[PDB]
RNA sequence: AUUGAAAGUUGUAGUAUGCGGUCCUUGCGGCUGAGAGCACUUCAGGAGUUGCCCGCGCCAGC
């Protein structure tokens, strides 16, 4: 319904709304407490059409899962791509390593 | 009003006194309203249905 330069420019404001996120503000009371922050690690996947939600960080062997989802959807035929962030995920899957929060996004918005 | 004139055929009298139509007598004895009989046989309370969607426990706290 909105023109198409409006959808973009909400992509990416949907995007870049990640910046203040991994960077510790999050949460309420940050007057006082501002958490001390430190993105450990992550990976992400964009793909174009509907793909399967990525498993939680809470567990503990969750980077296996992650690389047994990835493998199998990119061989079903889905064209996902792949970010990853202080994990190995492999040597067989053609994942970009970025090294932090707001060139991933860049790399996000490359794709519009 | 004369073959006429006056002239009770009358008085008293229980056809009465007593006397069970009576005595004895099972309408009685024996007798299955009885024997055989599924109120049975076949039946989905069934198909479709998000308890959904938006939501800072929030800001000033030597």
Known sequence: ???????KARIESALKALIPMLSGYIGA???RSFPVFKVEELVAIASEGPIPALVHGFYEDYIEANRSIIKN???????????????????????????????????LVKMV
């Open 73 to 107: 959807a990119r061989a079903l035929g889905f064209n996902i791509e792949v970010f990853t962030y202080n994990v190995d995920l492999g040597e067989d899957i053609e994942a970009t390593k970025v090294s932090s929060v707001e060139e991933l996004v860049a790399n």
């Open 29 to 31: 009371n940050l007057a």
């Open 1 to 7: 319904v909105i023109d198409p330069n409006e959808r």
